[PDB]
């Protein structure tokens, strides 16, 4: 997996990507498969978890194949792994 280490009390951007350079459906989920963030076509939605708030993305880069998860005011309790669902490229990342 890809591991990203921050300063803990900060804002972190983790990314999922696609080689299509197209905005496609995608999702971010945690280790217990709880939705964090994802899209609905052009629209941005949040997942109903502790990361529902304090979260963002970059809608403008979805057509560049870049589908980031931005977690604001990050807590130590948030240093979990996340699974990407972009196409079938089910990559895993870890946040520290």
């Amino acid at each position: 997996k890809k591991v990203v280490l921050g300063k803990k009390g900060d804002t972190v951007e983790l990314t999922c990507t696609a080689s299509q350079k197209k905005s496609i459906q995608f999702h971010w989920k945690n280790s217990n498969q709880i939705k964090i963030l994802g899209n609905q076509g052009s629209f941005l939605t949040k997942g109903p978890s502790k990361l529902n708030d304090r979260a963002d993305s970059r809608r403008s880069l979805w057509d560049q194949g870049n589908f980031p998860l931005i977690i604001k005011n990050l807590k130590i309790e948030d240093s979990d792994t996340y699974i990407c669902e972009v196409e079938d490229q089910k990559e895993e990342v870890q946040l520290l």
């Binding site: 905005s23 459906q25 999702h27 989920k29 217990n32 498969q33 709880i34 939705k35 994802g38 899209n39 609905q40 076509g41 052009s42 629209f43 941005l44 939605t45 949040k46 997942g47 109903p48 978890s49 529902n52 708030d53 809608r59 403008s60 979805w62 057509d63 669902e85």
Partner: protein
Amino acid sequence: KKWVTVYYGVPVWKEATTTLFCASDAKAYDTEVHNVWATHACVPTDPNPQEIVLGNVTENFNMWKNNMVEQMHEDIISLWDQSLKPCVKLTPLNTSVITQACPKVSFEPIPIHYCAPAGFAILKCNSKTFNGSGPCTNVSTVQCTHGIRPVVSTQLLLNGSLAEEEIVIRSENITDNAKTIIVQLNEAVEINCTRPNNNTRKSNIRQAHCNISKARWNETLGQIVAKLEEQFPFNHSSGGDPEIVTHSFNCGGEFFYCNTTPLFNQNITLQCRIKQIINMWQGVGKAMYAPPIRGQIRCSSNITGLLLTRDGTFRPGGGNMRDNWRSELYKYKVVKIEPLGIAPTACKRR
């Protein structure tokens, strides 16, 4: 003498793509958007539909891998760009922002059907237990679809078709807790949305309210839950762009945003607001539309389905217009026939 023998008239289907054309009962004299668009874009409707049932041929369908969806997407975004023009359009670049004049226009979606070009036909699934994918045991061939209204809908599906007998729950992966579940209802729920001509006050002019029959709403959810419980032996949207969170829609040319909290948790009333700033569904960008119309506007719509999600106990989802089209296009696929085939036969040449 078990030799290769060549035959014509082999009715073997291959899925194929083609530039399908549209048809509608367009008028060209009423100034309304769809009938001043469809009159140059679409032809008159099919004068003689055939519904030919192909015996008992079993055919595999997959509503999430369909291509008729892309055809519908491109024509609808052309329709919108060519009619409901925003005053200010903002496209990501840095940004690129342009402006336009804003005549207001009437906007009332009409059914539009897609038709096969010569050499092609559309197969459709008549199963009452469609599921979403897999083998269909009742397949018929038509040239054209029945006609689907280009209604944006966004959260709950408006002015579509019914499942007739049972609520059908369709999902690419019903247990992945990621994809939107499309719920096709066996009954339409009537919704009456009004902005009375007394809302002339300013900070009012942007307020509106929608009335839902409680008996219909509760009976509908009771049936949906009963089916969810079979699959898996009660909340509102989690948040996000306002088009997802509220039941947004365009009606009369205006953009409504209705708060469905009272529905997801007689004469249930939703608070609705009319906005000038809308996040586009056509792609990523934003647009500003002209201020509200003085007068009284009333919309009456049929909820024929829902976009629901389930996490890793259900919520409204929304947006992703391709899904709204799938909710109606699920029954159809385009095929071509390759009439030349081979088989062993007990024969010799001469």
